[PDB]
Design an enzyme around this catalytic site. Sequence first.
Site, PDB file in Angstrom:
ATOM      1  N   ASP D  69       0.779  -0.917  -0.261  1.00 35.39           N
ATOM      2  CA  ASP D  69       0.224  -0.102  -0.150  1.00 35.39           C
ATOM      3  C   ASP D  69       1.278   1.194   0.382  1.00 35.39           C
ATOM      4  O   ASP D  69       0.313   2.017  -0.947  1.00 35.39           O
ATOM      5  CB  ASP D  69      -0.749   0.142   1.573  1.00 35.39           C
ATOM      6  CG  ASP D  69      -2.127  -1.303   1.621  1.00 35.39           C
ATOM      7  OD1 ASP D  69      -2.389  -1.211   0.317  1.00 35.39           O
ATOM      8  OD2 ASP D  69      -1.271  -2.252   2.171  1.00 35.39           O
ATOM      9  N   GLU D 196      -7.461   6.604  10.490  1.00 35.74           N
ATOM     10  CA  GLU D 196      -8.054   7.882   9.268  1.00 35.74           C
ATOM     11  C   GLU D 196      -9.362   8.578   9.589  1.00 35.74           C
ATOM     12  O   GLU D 196     -10.668   8.095   9.163  1.00 35.74           O
ATOM     13  CB  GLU D 196      -8.972   6.857   8.257  1.00 35.74           C
ATOM     14  CG  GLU D 196      -7.489   5.348   8.260  1.00 35.74           C
ATOM     15  CD  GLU D 196      -7.583   4.351   7.363  1.00 35.74           C
ATOM     16  OE1 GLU D 196      -9.290   3.582   7.378  1.00 35.74           O
ATOM     17  OE2 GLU D 196      -6.665   4.145   6.561  1.00 35.74           O
ATOM     18  N   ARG D 211     -12.087   5.651  12.892  1.00 38.49           N
ATOM     19  CA  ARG D 211     -12.180   3.991  12.458  1.00 38.49           C
ATOM     20  C   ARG D 211     -10.778   3.548  14.284  1.00 38.49           C
ATOM     21  O   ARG D 211      -9.450   4.094  14.510  1.00 38.49           O
ATOM     22  CB  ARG D 211     -11.063   4.099  11.462  1.00 38.49           C
ATOM     23  CG  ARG D 211     -10.597   2.592  11.238  1.00 38.49           C
ATOM     24  CD  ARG D 211     -10.042   2.793   9.616  1.00 38.49           C
ATOM     25  NE  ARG D 211      -9.733   0.688   9.691  1.00 38.49           N
ATOM     26  CZ  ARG D 211      -9.055   0.782   8.493  1.00 38.49           C
ATOM     27  NH1 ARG D 211      -9.422   0.717   7.126  1.00 38.49           N
ATOM     28  NH2 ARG D 211      -8.848  -0.627   8.034  1.00 38.49           N
ATOM     29  N   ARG D 286     -16.960  -4.787   3.258  1.00 39.93           N
ATOM     30  CA  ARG D 286     -17.202  -3.783   2.703  1.00 39.93           C
ATOM     31  C   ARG D 286     -18.421  -4.162   1.564  1.00 39.93           C
ATOM     32  O   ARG D 286     -17.961  -3.871   0.908  1.00 39.93           O
ATOM     33  CB  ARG D 286     -15.965  -2.899   2.262  1.00 39.93           C
ATOM     34  CG  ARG D 286     -14.916  -2.379   4.095  1.00 39.93           C
ATOM     35  CD  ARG D 286     -13.199  -2.402   3.060  1.00 39.93           C
ATOM     36  NE  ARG D 286     -12.560  -2.430   3.829  1.00 39.93           N
ATOM     37  CZ  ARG D 286     -11.909  -1.877   4.478  1.00 39.93           C
ATOM     38  NH1 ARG D 286     -10.779  -1.631   3.243  1.00 39.93           N
ATOM     39  NH2 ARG D 286     -10.816  -1.767   5.463  1.00 39.93           N
ATOM     40  N   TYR D 320     -14.239   3.267   1.709  1.00 39.68           N
ATOM     41  CA  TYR D 320     -14.378   3.997   2.577  1.00 39.68           C
ATOM     42  C   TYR D 320     -15.456   4.860   2.748  1.00 39.68           C
ATOM     43  O   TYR D 320     -15.695   4.779   1.689  1.00 39.68           O
ATOM     44  CB  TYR D 320     -12.614   4.199   2.698  1.00 39.68           C
ATOM     45  CG  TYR D 320     -11.685   3.710   3.030  1.00 39.68           C
ATOM     46  CD1 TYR D 320     -11.767   2.937   2.849  1.00 39.68           C
ATOM     47  CD2 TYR D 320      -9.726   4.532   2.777  1.00 39.68           C
ATOM     48  CE1 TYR D 320     -11.076   1.797   4.109  1.00 39.68           C
ATOM     49  CE2 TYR D 320      -9.621   3.981   4.107  1.00 39.68           C
ATOM     50  CZ  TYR D 320      -8.860   2.954   3.793  1.00 39.68           C
ATOM     51  OH  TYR D 320      -8.236   2.057   4.772  1.00 39.68           O
TER      52      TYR D 320
END
Lengths: 385, 385, 385, 385
Positions: D69, D196, D211, D286, D320
């Site tokens: 990432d 975040e 989060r 998600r 997100y």
Amino acid sequence: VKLAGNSSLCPINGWAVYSKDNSIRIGSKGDVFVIREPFISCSHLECRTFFLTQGALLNDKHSNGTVKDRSPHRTLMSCPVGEAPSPYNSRFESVAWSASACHDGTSWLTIGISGPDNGAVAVLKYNGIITDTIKSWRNNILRTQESECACVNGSCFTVMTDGPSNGQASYKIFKMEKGKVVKSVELDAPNYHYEECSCYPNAGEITCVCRDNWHGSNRPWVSFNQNLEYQIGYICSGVFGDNPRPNDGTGSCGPVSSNGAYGVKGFSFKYGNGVWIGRTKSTNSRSGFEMIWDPNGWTETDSSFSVKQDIVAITDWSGYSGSFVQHPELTGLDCIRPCFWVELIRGRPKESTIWTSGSSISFCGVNSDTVGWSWPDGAELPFTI
Amino acid sequence: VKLAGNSSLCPINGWAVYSKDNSIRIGSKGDVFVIREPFISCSHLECRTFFLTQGALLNDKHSNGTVKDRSPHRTLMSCPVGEAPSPYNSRFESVAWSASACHDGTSWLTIGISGPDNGAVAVLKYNGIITDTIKSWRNNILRTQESECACVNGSCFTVMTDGPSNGQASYKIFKMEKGKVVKSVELDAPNYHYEECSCYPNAGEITCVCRDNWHGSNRPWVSFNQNLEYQIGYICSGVFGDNPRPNDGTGSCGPVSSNGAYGVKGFSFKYGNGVWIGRTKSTNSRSGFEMIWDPNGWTETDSSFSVKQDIVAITDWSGYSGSFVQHPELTGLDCIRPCFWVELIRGRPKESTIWTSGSSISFCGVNSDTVGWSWPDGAELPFTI
Amino acid sequence: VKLAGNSSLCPINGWAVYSKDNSIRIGSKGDVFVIREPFISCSHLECRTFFLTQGALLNDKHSNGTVKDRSPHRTLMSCPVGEAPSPYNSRFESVAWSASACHDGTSWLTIGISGPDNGAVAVLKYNGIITDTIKSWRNNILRTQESECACVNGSCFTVMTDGPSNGQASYKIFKMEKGKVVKSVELDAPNYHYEECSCYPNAGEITCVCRDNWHGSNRPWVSFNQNLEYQIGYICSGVFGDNPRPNDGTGSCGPVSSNGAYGVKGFSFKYGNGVWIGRTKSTNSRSGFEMIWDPNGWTETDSSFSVKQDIVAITDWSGYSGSFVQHPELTGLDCIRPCFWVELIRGRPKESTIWTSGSSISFCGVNSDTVGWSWPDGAELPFTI
Amino acid sequence: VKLAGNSSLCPINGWAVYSKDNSIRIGSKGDVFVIREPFISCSHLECRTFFLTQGALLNDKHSNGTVKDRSPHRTLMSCPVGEAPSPYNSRFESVAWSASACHDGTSWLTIGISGPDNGAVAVLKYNGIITDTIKSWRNNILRTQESECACVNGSCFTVMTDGPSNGQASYKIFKMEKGKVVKSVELDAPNYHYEECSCYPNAGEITCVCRDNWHGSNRPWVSFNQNLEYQIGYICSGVFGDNPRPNDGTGSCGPVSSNGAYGVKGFSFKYGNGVWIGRTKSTNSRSGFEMIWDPNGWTETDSSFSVKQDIVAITDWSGYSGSFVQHPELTGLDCIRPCFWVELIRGRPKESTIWTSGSSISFCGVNSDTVGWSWPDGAELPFTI
Ligand SMILES: CCC(CC)O[C@@H]1C=C(C(=O)O)C[C@H](N)[C@H]1NC(C)=O
């Protein structure tokens, strides 16, 4: 400074080519959006082509087009006139599967309708910031113009319909300032059917020539004043405007039932008792397009007119067409320019492809002379698919 | 503020490269339009390249180019100078298969002709909005410059032809202000043939060097006052400027008929009695280009000149060329900059492809010194087709 | 208003990343120019990346790249910092195979050299219009910085060289204003060799740290006033900055011959007697980059320095690097912000591909502390070819 | 003129669709960046979409995605809202594998963190130019919001975390002016875990809902005044807001451990003791998204709430989501408009491709009514790979 709508349509004798985007020809290789109802609308400074896109490019799998018309992926966007609408030159306007837009002289008002068929909602945006919302009042496909809304004296207006695309439906005209509905009226139009209206300002009032998808080969119209006091009727001209339609015979001032049980977004410009009518050349397909000047045909029933200006040959496809205006404040003129755009639709369902999109061409008013011709889309189908 | 065209052409010794768009090389993968006649024109702030497209991208099936020159898809567009013309970066200008454009200090004037050959209509636009219409007056392919027009004191001028591209034709000079014809004159030019005029302002007047497609190897010219009072003639230099043409022998001040019964858009800059002749290196093909300074050569017949500056080697392809100017209001200079562009044609008919497009290079006047060389198109042919 | 170059470099502790364009990685699919020497330069309002392109895109046949370095297709262009250079976001600057550019607070000055090796000519443009010309004075590859020139007090300066890339060449400093060379001086530098200089303003003067392609592993420098009265020398530090070079041994204030017989565009910032040196990490290849702070090193001979900040790992390719400046007019700082950029070259001659192009990364001055790391190009070669 | 954050959140009833970029569907052929965390943030004039990219385009091998990432190719860019991010429409913001951005009414502040895990550094830029640096103070992946920071009265705030993404980590709030840190404060949050954060100004104070990736199913929050005097806690509601999470049971004002041992970035708007909660519809994936209004649910524990508006069906993917805000200086309203964006992640790890990218959708506050519906990504995977 707000756009005054007090002047009158300029006097004209024909239509000059104003723009042709070649979207679909360009889109064979370029990153062009697959689109529908590419209407034009102008500000006090520039003109833009708005259109709705399934969020997919030509020649990509995602143009599959079997998708329902009204998908959550449909978006309203715009780009400068005559440019092929691509993700590289288009401004995002709103998420929607039906829409309209216009400029009050100050900012853009966009109106994007989205959501489920039984609860669709119209989002209004003044300068891109949501300013009001309108909900389906019949829970049966709230929908709008698919062309420029009309502004006058700092107020813009639009027509929305909710209800069946067969029998009676409901029609409301809306008056909004700075993107906020200050007033609305439901037309008492029994036996009438309004869809995809093409509206324009003229001497401080608005006129709309629409599509009657229920039972009329001629087109219904509505004109109202800034207080939403209106009048309604049908172009009585035997030069029928809708498509499909019967052969040009004897018209009438209410829904002509022979063949008029479907349709296409179109427009017409009223001059005194006369009419400039845009229509497809064919009576069955959305093929060809011509402008017809039937002086005194907005009120009288004939088959005769005096001028016919060709635009697209019967041998080439057309589709939606709508009207758009140039205000004196953009032109310097002392009248309002009537202009119109035509959607050249390619692919399904008339062609054997997996997709359907369209090109635009537009023309403007003008006193000097013009010529008829054919400005088709010009793409070779099918594509690499 | 209006552009004063009262200064004269800046004295110059040679030509420095100004730009090269490499469009055809980039087009091999990029989304570049296939184009023709990319003439340059400038405003008081910037210069743009105008060009015409069939509405197809290079390396795409639709660049098939077996289409008539004058199809209804040809459109006039512009993009910044030196950039590859793509729909991602070009501005739509007008629908046309012949045109000119020029800026008067305030806004751009564009002129695009479209329509059938028996009555093409020139649509004039000022700042994007239609301001006038000119109809064919012979009904035989009305056509114009294919390059920058000339503005002076707030009035712009152009030359149009109607009639045959063989024998005698009709030539007119137009004067417009803010996009509107305010005066026009038909030239009394028996035995003359004017086409694709390259015009430029000099000391309040316009001088155009054109193409005689009918029967001359030398280029004919017209000059006129702001009231369209004019003079005409042919470049007398034995350094024949058209193409095809015969080897440089003895000219004449009226159409040289050996070998010049066809031609190519070109330019020339008159200084006193001398001339900067831009032309191709070959006498049969649109290959190579060179600038030539034959002093006492605009009025005199010889073969002798004093300078020759190479631009494109006989071994590479060239094509249309035209003048554009840079006004002091853009430049800061106390005179008008003479510049020119050259179209580098690739593909048909000289190559074995299925299309024709051209790249562009331009050069500007200049006191300092330059170098001759070769700045060809540079693309590898054929393309994936 | 003209950029005042009277303030001094800002004191700094390390370099914070400024940008990274990913061009080559993006260029695997997107339409990205194949480029070289993407130097950055800023105005009073924005920073831009200039670069030279062969007029070709990554992954197209025309990136074939076997072409001479100096082709007539080479052009100077620019796009915003951090963006991949494509024909869709780049401004055209000039036709050029060697170049430099810099803004004086009012308009951009670009210098693009084109033409044959025995007589190249540098075209200067102020706001895009030609303002001067300089011809080769040795007829042997006239060439320039390939990085930002420096402006102070409304005058910009650059260094060009003409002559061989082995033995003695000729070196000249040009002072220009509004793009017109108002003074020049040939350096009297026997045994010196100057190519690809990276110049920057400081306290009203210009200092340039260049490349000695003939016989130096250390970088030569030139610093001059606004009257072109200059001084010259080599960075004496034993932390040799050229590439190729020897292992860091003992340096000297004139050319270090050993292994110094070729090189790469580099830069260095002088602060009193110290130097911030940027160099590749390998001593035989263009791979890795590191910023080294050797105080008392511009005048001394050591191998020792106090700080090393990795920028690109030895296991990854680098290339040219140069300095560019911030001025207090764009920043608001009371000093000049030294920044730099590094070219990540991929393809030939180190890699088995048919092309060569590079990506860019940039860093700036900064008082706060940073972190060394590795920000390589990151493309997977070879490409679809 | 600086943005005052003195007004309160506008009262609202539901959420109107604001934008949908369809970037994945488009990237299927078009050159669109493969992105992650596309947060929206607005100025006093426009709203842009910031996102992070690996420097690769969809359907190209460089999107291979097996990459850490946190790569050095990861960059922060922006483009207008609702447009597909492509190198042709996006602005370069910063080199960053974690970032945030906000406009203080004058210029934009971007915070991009790059560098290695043991000592990353947050580069602050104000109006494109670096204005400060913040180094990891725990050498264990410094990270920030991945969403808009909050500005009030000319000071903007952000929250960063450093430490493990399991156990106790370190959490600090920063206040900056003109991109310069002027004050920072470490939260005394034992047993809390912030990551975040979605923050927003309200009545001159900031509120962030974040989060908890360590051991919380509910979301933790921090609210602070302009002097970084603060408070902390968790959303007590049993309408668990994280993902994964357990079925909606009884919650607590401190980390709910049952299943919240990982998570996803999210937001919530506080109104009195009530809370608008944005969350996925599945408790494990998600997938899907919905807005729930739990009045008296920010301080209370229930499973009961009053309104539930659908945004994405359980059957489609999501990702997100973050709050952004519209200020009165932009809206003309007398209160701060709350909006949110939703990230629609396709590809890995849930689908069988080699890449991961997200589309975006967004909605704004609003008093009129809306409708629940589903606006999924709509792309057909796998791609040509
Ligand atoms: C390292 C902690 C943080 C939250 C778990 O990880 C994030 C999780 C992500 C996720 O689960 O979606 C992707 C983020 N880009 C990543 N950010 C960083 C800093 O690497």
